[PDB]
Amino acid sequence: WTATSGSCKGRCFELQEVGPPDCRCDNLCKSYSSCCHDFDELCLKTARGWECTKDRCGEVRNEENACHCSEDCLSRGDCCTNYQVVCKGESHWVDDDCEEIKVPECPAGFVRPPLIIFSVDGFRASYMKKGSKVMPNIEKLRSCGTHAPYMRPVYPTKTFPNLYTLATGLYPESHGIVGNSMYDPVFDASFHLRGREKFNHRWWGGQPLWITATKQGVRAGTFFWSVSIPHERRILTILQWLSLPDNERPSVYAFYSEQPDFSGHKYGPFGPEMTNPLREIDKTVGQLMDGLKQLRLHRCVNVIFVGDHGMEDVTCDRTEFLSNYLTNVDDITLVPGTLGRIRAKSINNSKYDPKTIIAALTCKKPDQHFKPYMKQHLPKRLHYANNRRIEDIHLLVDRRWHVARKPLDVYKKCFFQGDHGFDNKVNSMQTVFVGYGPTFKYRTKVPPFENIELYNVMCDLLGLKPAPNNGTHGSLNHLLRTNTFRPTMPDEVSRPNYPGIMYLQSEFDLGCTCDDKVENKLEELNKRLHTKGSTKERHLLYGRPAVLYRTSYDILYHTDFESGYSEIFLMPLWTSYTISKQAEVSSIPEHLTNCVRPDVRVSPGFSQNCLAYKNDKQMSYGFLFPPYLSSSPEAKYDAFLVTNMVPMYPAFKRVWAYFQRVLVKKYASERNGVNVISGPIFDYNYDGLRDTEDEIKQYVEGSSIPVPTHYYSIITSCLDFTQPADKCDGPLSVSSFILPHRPDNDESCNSSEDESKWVEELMKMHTARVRDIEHLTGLDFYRKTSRSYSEILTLKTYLHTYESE
Ligand SMILES: *[C@@H]1O[C@H](CO)[C@@H](O[C@@H]2O[C@H](CO)[C@@H](O[C@@H]3O[C@H](CO[C@H]4O[C@H](CO)[C@@H](O)[C@H](O[C@H]5O[C@H](CO)[C@@H](O)[C@H](O)[C@@H]5O[C@H]5O[C@H](CO)[C@@H](O)[C@H](O)[C@@H]5O)[C@@H]4O)[C@@H](O)[C@H](O[C@H]4O[C@H](CO)[C@@H](O)[C@H](O)[C@@H]4O[C@H]4O[C@H](CO)[C@@H](O)[C@H](O)[C@@H]4O)[C@@H]3O)[C@H](O)[C@H]2NC(C)=O)[C@H](O)[C@H]1NC(C)=O
Ligand SMILES: O=C(c1cc(OCC2CCOCC2)nc(C2CC2)c1)N1Cc2ccc(C(=O)N3CCc4onc(O)c4C3)cc2C1
Ligand SMILES: [Ca+2]
Ligand SMILES: [Ca+2]
Ligand SMILES: [Cl-]
Ligand SMILES: [K+]
Ligand code: NA
Ligand SMILES: [Zn+2]
Numbered sequence: 001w002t003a004t005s006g007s008c009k010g011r012c013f014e015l016q017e018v019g020p021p022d023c024r025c026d027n028l029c030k031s032y033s034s035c036c037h038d039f040d041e042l043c044l045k046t047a048r049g050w051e052c053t054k055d056r057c058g059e060v061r062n063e064e065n066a067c068h069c070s071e072d073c074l075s076r077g078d079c080c081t082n083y084q085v086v087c088k089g090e091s092h093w094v095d096d097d098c099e100e101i102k103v104p105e106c107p108a109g110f111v112r113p114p115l116i117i118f119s120v121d122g123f124r125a126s127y128m129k130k131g132s133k134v135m136p137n138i139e140k141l142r143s144c145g146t147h148a149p150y151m152r153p154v155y156p157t158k159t160f161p162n163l164y165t166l167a168t169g170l171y172p173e174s175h176g177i178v179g180n181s182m183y184d185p186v187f188d189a190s191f192h193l194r195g196r197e198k199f200n201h202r203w204w205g206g207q208p209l210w211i212t213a214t215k216q217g218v219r220a221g222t223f224f225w226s227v228s229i230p231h232e233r234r235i236l237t238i239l240q241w242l243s244l245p246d247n248e249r250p251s252v253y254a255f256y257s258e259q260p261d262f263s264g265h266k267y268g269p270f271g272p273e274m275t276n277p278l279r280e281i282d283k284t285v286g287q288l289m290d291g292l293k294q295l296r297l298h299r300c301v302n303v304i305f306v307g308d309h310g311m312e313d314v315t316c317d318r319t320e321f322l323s324n325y326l327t328n329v330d331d332i333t334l335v336p337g338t339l340g341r342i343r344a345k346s347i348n349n350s351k352y353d354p355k356t357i358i359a360a361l362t363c364k365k366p367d368q369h370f371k372p373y374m375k376q377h378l379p380k381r382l383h384y385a386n387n388r389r390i391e392d393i394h395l396l397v398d399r400r401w402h403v404a405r406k407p408l409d410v411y412k413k414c415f416f417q418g419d420h421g422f423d424n425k426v427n428s429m430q431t432v433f434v435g436y437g438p439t440f441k442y443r444t445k446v447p448p449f450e451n452i453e454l455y456n457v458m459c460d461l462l463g464l465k466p467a468p469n470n471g472t473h474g475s476l477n478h479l480l481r482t483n484t485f486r487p488t489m490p491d492e493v494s495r496p497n498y499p500g501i502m503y504l505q506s507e508f509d510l511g512c513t514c515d516d517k518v519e520n521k522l523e524e525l526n527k528r529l530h531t532k533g534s535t536k537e538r539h540l541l542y543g544r545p546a547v548l549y550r551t552s553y554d555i556l557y558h559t560d561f562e563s564g565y566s567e568i569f570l571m572p573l574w575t576s577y578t579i580s581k582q583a584e585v586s587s588i589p590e591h592l593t594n595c596v597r598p599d600v601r602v603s604p605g606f607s608q609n610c611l612a613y614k615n616d617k618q619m620s621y622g623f624l625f626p627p628y629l630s631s632s633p634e635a636k637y638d639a640f641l642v643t644n645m646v647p648m649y650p651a652f653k654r655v656w657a658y659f660q661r662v663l664v665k666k667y668a669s670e671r672n673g674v675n676v677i678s679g680p681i682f683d684y685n686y687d688g689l690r691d692t693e694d695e696i697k698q699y700v701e702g703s704s705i706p707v708p709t710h711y712y713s714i715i716t717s718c719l720d721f722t723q724p725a726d727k728c729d730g731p732l733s734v735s736s737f738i739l740p741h742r743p744d745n746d747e748s749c750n751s752s753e754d755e756s757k758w759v760e761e762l763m764k765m766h767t768a769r770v771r772d773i774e775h776l777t778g779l780d781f782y783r784k785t786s787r788s789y790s791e792i793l794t795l796k797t798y799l800h801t802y803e804s805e
Contacts, residue, residue: 577625
């Protein structure tokens with residue numbers, strides 16, 4: 001209900017929105033259908049356009065005009081943005097050479113540099129280079145400020161999840177906006193782009209920037225713009241707010257544009273029609289910069305130019321239809337398009353079985369353009385499972401394709417040539433970042449980073465303490481001239497034991513046979529010294545990882561590898577080893593094939609046993625330090641210690657063996673040695689965090705040996721590959737993975753072939769950040785390097801995407 005009967009005189013674009021039924025005059029009143037009767041007349045003036053002309057210079061103010069060219073306009077803050085250019089002989093900002101902004105050059109009364117966030121929907125990363133000739137204003141921001149070559153969105157690469165991530169620093173699964181369309185089964189309510197339900201505050205979790213600001217006494221402009229407010233009026237409003245007195249003027253502002261996304265959907269990302277919306281956005285940027293220049297704020301404000309996601313070529317004809325796969329297609333509900341989410345049409349359907357659905361959708365056509373997952377089996381880098389709003393059944397859709405339920409959904413609705421929503425590592429989904437201002441660096445290019453990191457940086461720019469979020473605060477310090485955030489390494493919670501030889505061989509009854517009864521003081525003090533950690537400098541390059549939770553574990557030293565062995569999980573948390581460029585692969589000798597040896601440093605009671613694997617017909621075992629890479633046949637015995645064994649499904653063994661026997665050596669050749677840290681992950685509740693012991697859902701039959709849901713490896717080397725990994729003097733290079741520990745390879749459609757035709761493809765899909773692994777394990781890596789801690793935080797956030805440039 002609305003009493004649209006009140007007035008908007010002097011309340012135009014009000015910052016404090018009023019409550020029903022009193023009539024609103026804020027930038028969203030239209031979208032709620034609640035504007036006072038006189039809103040259009042007073043707040044959406046258009047008379048005489050958006051530009052001064054020589055005829056208007058020194059006009060008599062007339063309050064009907066959209067903007068002003070009267071002598072008084074600057075003190076009132078409502079000049080047309082081009083007023084000084086036309087009337088006072090100034091240049092457009094874009095025509096001025098850039099000059100380093102060493103300090104904020106702000107009017108007296110400004111307590112901090114204001115922040116303006118200029119967000120462009122669907123602005124694909126490659127537009128910065130491909131459109132540079134038609135976007136001079138943006139081009140000057142980019143070249144003179146700090147820029148990345150791209151910024152990685154979150155999954156799914158849609159509008160509301162990304163905008164809300166930019167606002168909060170949270171993954172979708174945590175902030176709650178997991179799609180542009182959602183069903184919440186707890187509320188029994190639906191969220192859609194279109195309609196009113198999306199305005200209900202129960203959808204929107206975490207704490208977005210404007211709330212963070214307000215709670216710490218920093219005043220915010222309204223972030224949201226009804227689609228009917230023209231861009232020029234959004235810019236003028238922001239400029240007018242910037243002219244307010246000290247106690248009223250906001251410190252943080254946002255401009256949002258629906259372009260180039262609107263046009264990209266109709267014409268495709270590089271359609272010839274796209275040039276004009278890129279020109280129009282650049283013009284809007286030039287109005288903002290000219291406007292700031294006339295207010296003498298162009299060297300005072302920090303400007304962020306950012307997008308939500310990119311845009312791919314997608315047409316009607318590249319639709320997969322589930323009615324080609326499923327006999328029961330009317331018993332499901334599908335959220336369709338560039339991703340798929342499936343649930344039962346009716347929860348009273350006891351015949352609905354997700355396993356048979358998944359099975360019917362798996363590797364059925366030879367170039368099938370989607371892949372079905374249970375949500376817990378999606379790549380852990382997507383962080384796309386821990387929310388009741390995400391359906392159990394997910395379809396990851398190939399770039400350039402759609403998925404739909406039946407043909408009638410896609411022709412009773414080709415219109416469009418563009419779409420987005422794909423996997424967030426897909427190059428077409430990448431978007432933009434530029435920072436320009438006194439707190440940003442000058443003419444600096446920074447590596448690509450994830451949009452989950454920006455909220456912290458926006459908080460640093462405003463002097464705010466960020467709410468808890470998924471950013472890694474300090475990982476983006478290299479973008480900032482000042483206001484950097486300098487954290488301390490987390491404190492180690494559990495200190496390790498360093499056990500010696502405490503158990504006789506006959507105390508063990510492992511059902512584990514080993515033919516190792518195969519016999520000198522030269523070599524005996526040398527093997528003793530390896531057990532006490534004499535090669536640890538070699539295999540533990542960056543220090544031991546710290547354990548950030550309360551537990552019982554032991555450090556175990558060996559010739560070729562070092563491990564942190566959990567007495568609670570009966571296996572290593574981590575195993576660390578260095579393979580040089582020269583290392584030789586050998587094979588497992590036949591006198592050791594099914595050998596597992598007791599580790600006389602670790603109790604039988606805190607050891608695994610072979611009998612449990614023998615009895616478990618589904619489960620087998622592998623090794624964390626690969627016996628294939630042992631340095632000598634004497635050191636090879638260490639690799640068969642029971643304390644280096646981990647539970648593995650035979651299907652996963654094919655992956656792991658190929659990684660260890662073929663890929664590690666290959667990476668050592670390419671990178672000039674590698675350091676490898678490998679271990680188990682337990683995330684049975686798919687929350688992205690280390691499981692406690694009581695969350696573990698599966699054990700090796702008849703034992704207390706828990707089964708990992710994933711295995712990780714972190715592969716580190718020298719960024720300058722002319723130095724070996726063990727004598728690196730400068731920055732590091734890293735690639736990692738979190739491989740799903742699955743009992744089949746249904747994921748890999750070509751898995752009946754040789755491992756050289758499918759394993760690497762699987763590993764690429766499950767590439768990970770170190771930081772992902774840290775959350776999943778409760779470990780902290782890279783504790784002892786030469787490098788600054790912020791540089792190490794940048795490293796830990798790196799994702800190796802395997803996409804071309
Ligand atoms: C990414 O960054 C974020 C932010 O840092 C990380 O998420 C945090 O994860 C924490 C651990 O999972 C979690 O802490 C829990 O908080 C519970 C109280 O939470 C409410 O209050 C906070 C603060 O205002 C608020 O943030 C929460 O918001 C969530 O829920 C609302 C719904 O109201 C959503 O709108 C919002 O989107 C958000 O949803 C997300 O998180 C929840 C979990 O909180 C998920 O369920 C959703 O899917 C979604 O992901 C809340 O409004 C508190 O109950 C927890 O405590 C339980 O467990 C501890 C063990 O330490 C125990 O001591 C407690 O007693 C309690 O146990 C009891 O409850 C159990 C469960 O019901 C029960 O089984 C037991 O028997 C006990 O009786 C816990 O402290 C924190 O909430 C979130 N924050 C956010 C914003 O998500 C995230 O982990 C990072 N991701 C990665 C990969 O690093
Ligand atoms: O003003 C905002 C806005 C802005 C916003 O900004 C959050 C900021 C962003 C920068 O960093 C700080 C947080 N957030 C939010 C909310 C998360 C809090 C909203 N709008 C208006 C508007 C109008 C229409 C639509 C829309 O339906 N489409 C256009 C884009 C698109 O692409 N494909 C498609 O189909 C569509 C269809 C979306 C918005 C977002
Ligand atoms: Ca968008
Ligand atoms: Ca977990
Ligand atoms: Cl969606
Ligand atoms: K077995
Ligand atoms: Na397969
Ligand atoms: Zn779109």
